[PDB]
Amino acid sequence: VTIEDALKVVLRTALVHDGLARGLRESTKALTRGEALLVVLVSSVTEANIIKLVEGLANDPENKVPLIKVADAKQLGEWAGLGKIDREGNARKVVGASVVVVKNWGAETDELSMIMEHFS
Amino acid sequence: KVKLAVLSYYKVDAEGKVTKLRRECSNPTCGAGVFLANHKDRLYCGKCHSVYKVNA
Amino acid sequence: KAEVMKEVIAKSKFYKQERQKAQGIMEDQIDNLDDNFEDVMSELMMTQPKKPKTDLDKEYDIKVKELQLDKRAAPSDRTKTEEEKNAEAEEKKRELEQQRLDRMNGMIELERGVEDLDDGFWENSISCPRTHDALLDQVKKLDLDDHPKIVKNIIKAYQPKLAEGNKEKLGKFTAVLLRHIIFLSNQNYLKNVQSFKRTQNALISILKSLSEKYNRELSEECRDYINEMQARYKKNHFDALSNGDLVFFSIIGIL
Amino acid sequence: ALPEKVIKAYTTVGSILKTWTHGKLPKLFKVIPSLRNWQDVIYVTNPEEWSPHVVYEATKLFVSNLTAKESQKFINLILLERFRDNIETSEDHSLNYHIYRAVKKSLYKPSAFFKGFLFPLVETGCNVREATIAGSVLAKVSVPALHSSAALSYLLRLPFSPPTTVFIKILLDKKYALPYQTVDDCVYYFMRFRILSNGEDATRVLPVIWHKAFLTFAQRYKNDITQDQRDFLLETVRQRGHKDIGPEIRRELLAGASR
RNA sequence: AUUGUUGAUUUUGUGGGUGGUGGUGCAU
Ligand SMILES: [Zn+2]
Known part of the structure; x- marks a missing residue:
């Protein structure tokens, strides 16, 4: 089980329980309110300001929130569930997500423990 | 439309320190993260529609 | 009757006065309340x-999030019986036949008449080619028998639904397709008559489908060509005329 | 206990809302959603006493501004109750034109509507007239395919009652691209009324609306079911088929291709 | 996208099914 594969299930479980803040504005709002448990940020964001702000908020001394890097924004959006399912079953019309923040894990899964263990 | 409007609310220094450039609404339901629109003569909340004075 | 009427009119105006007063008092209450808005808040x-x-509420929120993972089934319409389809087809045939008879007898659709026209007459990946030359460049390197394939692909790649503006692009392509049908006939083809016969009629069959939706674009190109044949005839007489004109006059009868 | 001055302030509002028909609403009223204790502020305004006109305007204001969990409370405690009482107390058992619009606006937030309006209604002795009126709102207004599919799967799982079958028939008429999971759930519902060990539903007399709903499923989702799923339904129409609808259901099922 | 700040509920292009909180009588 790779780290990337672990996040596939972890984010999906959060979606099922409405525990994800999808997008920059929701992610920034969630971080400032202290409801963020994990941050997944895209490394390939064209605007350096987006990376700088989220990293600063995630590293706030009052509320330190773990941060993860993902290569592609389009690939993150599929985890966030933005895209739709085609007849073949492949994701279609997927929408990129620069940032995704988890507010509630919903269910305790071994993959969640694996993600936490790396950060500790 | 305004593009990447959230970025304008925050300024981050070279040291990574994040400073808020806009005030938050004090309404308990709005809570933290709800930012008052800065007008010339007033501060306006887009959520609860409250109005606050600029130098209050 | 008159006294009953003045009673009814008077009764109506008296309530109409009451409602306006009641409306006025309500606005006064709202204004006073708004002035006290800051104090109360x-x-x-x-x-x-x-x-x-x-x-129960959890399950519904859970449920919605699985359904998006699932694939979606295509809905279908009720099947008409063969009798209903035949009756509908027969009904359409009757209407179209009647309209043709009406037009044959002078009914002009804008339903005027021929006599109306006689006033003042005597007294006075895949690229969609907007021009015919563009189509040839796309099909320059292909065999003759492969023209229907690209022409059909250009239609498929640019259906109206895929993007806005595709109706106009296919509208221009209908004109461009017609200039191709006549263009190929001008070109020498005795070597491969069988191959030419396979492409030329296939293109005409395609052109017929376009005309059903884009007759207006086709009509404009048709009238321009009639002007072009006339203009070339004025200077060259028969030397202007070619096999393409004979083919052209035939396609118009089809469409 | 609200501040005593506030009580007069909103009691005055309550009088205004009773007769309100047009114009601008009270400004104290338009800020109720932003209040945390709106359940207490809303009480002094006498929601049961609102004019039908205010109910529509409150639905615009409260649904759009409150959160999804809270809007469910508004739709359930206020909009649903006014919907039921209005049908019962009207001479012709119809619904007022403005209460009718409020349900449509409440459908703007499908999650709150289904859990606040629809499911409580069918689980609290909905009658045929209420199902028809609420079915019409659901038929006319656009709803997301995802929420309806969860909702459609929900009603099929409840005990059989004609009022519930009205909503089942409506949700099938909508011609949504129902996900395969929901299509299966529809198959099980119709399958469970076939006599085999089975419940009373096998022998329960079936009104016409059950057969119209089963014809609606056949007309639209015949091409969406497996061959196995096809034969069970074909068995069902053989045993529980109607005199006139049954043959039409059979014609549609045989004409479909397996997925 | 869009609501009035909000978050995919809408908007846009192309097709397209619908008379239906419709009446009025008849048959437990
Ligand atoms: Zn506020």
Whole structure:
């Protein structure tokens, strides 16, 4: 089980329980309110300001929130569930997500423990 | 439309320190993260529609 | 009757006066309340109280999030019986036949008549080619028998639904396709008559489908060509005329 | 206990809302959603006493501004109750034109509507007239395919009652691209009324609306079911088929291709 | 996208099914 594969299930479980803040504005709002448990940020964001702000908020001394890097924004959006399912079953019309923040894990899964263990 | 409007609310220094450039609404339901629109003569909340004075 | 009527008119105006007064008092209450808006909100905020879903409610929120993972089935319409389809087809045939008879007898659709026209007459990946030359460049390197394939692909790649503006692009392509049908006939083809016969009629069959939706674009190109044949005839006489014109006049009868 | 001055302030509002028909609403009223204790502020305004006109305007204001969990409370405690009482107390058992619009606006937030309006209604002795009126709102207004599919799967799982079958028939008429999971759930519902060990539903007399709903499923989702799923339904129409609808259901099922 | 700040509920292009909180009588 790779780290990337672990996040596939972890984010999906959060979606099922409405525990994800999808997008920059929701992610920034969630971080400032202290409801963020994990941050997944895209490394390939064209605007350096987006990376700088989220990293600063995630590293706030009052509320330190773990941060993860993902290569592609389009690939993150599929985890966030933005895209739709085609007849073949492949994701279609997927929408990129620069940032995704988890507010509630919903269910305790071994993959969640694996993600936490790396950060500790 | 305004593009990447959230970025304008925050300024981050070279040291990574994040400073808020806009005030938050004090309404308990709005809570933290709800930012008052800065007008010339007033501060306006887009959520609860409250109005606050600029130098209050 | 008259006294009953003045009673009814008087009764109506008397209520109409009451409603306007009642409306006026209500607006006065709202204005006074709005003036006291700041005062009331103050203490109300001061008294703002300090800081589980039903298991049925959980299931619904759970359920919606699985359904998006699932694939979606295509809905279908009720099947008409063969009798209903035949009756509908027969009904359409009757209407079209009647319209043709009406037009044959002078009914002009804008339903005027021929006599109306006689006033003042005597007294006075895949690229969609907007021009015919563009189509040839795309099909320059292909065999003759492969023209229907690209022409059909250009239609498929640019259906109206895929993007806005595709109706106009296919509208121009209908004109461009017609200039191709006549263009190929001009070109020498005795070597491969069988191959030419396979492409030329296939293109005409395609052109017929376009005309059903884009007759207006086709009509404009048709009238321009008739002007072009006339103009070339004025200077060259028969030397202007070619096999393409004979083919052209035939396609118009089809469409 | 609200501030005593506030009580007069909103009691005055309550009088205004009773007769309100047009114009601008009270400004104290338009800020109720932003209040945390709106359940207490809303009480002094006498929601049961609102004019039908205010109910529509409150639905615009409260649904759009409150959160999804809270809007469910508004739709359930206020909009649903006014919907039921209005049908019962009207001479012709119809619904007022403005209460009718409020349900449509409450459908703007499908999650709150289904859990606040629809499911409580069918689980609290909905009658045929209420199902028809609420079915019409659901038929006319656009709803997301995802929420309806969860909702459609929900009603099929409840005990059989004609009022519930009205909503089942409506949700099938909508011609949504129902996900395969929901299509299966529809198959099980119709399958469970076939006599085999089975419940009373096998022998329960079936009104016409059950057969119209089963014809609606056949007309639209015949091409969406497996061959196995096809034969069970074909068995069902053989045993529980109607005199006139049954043959039409059979014609549609045989004409479909397996997925 | 869009609501009035909000978050995919809408908007846009192309097709397209619908008379239906419709009446009025008849048959437990
Ligand atoms: Zn506020």
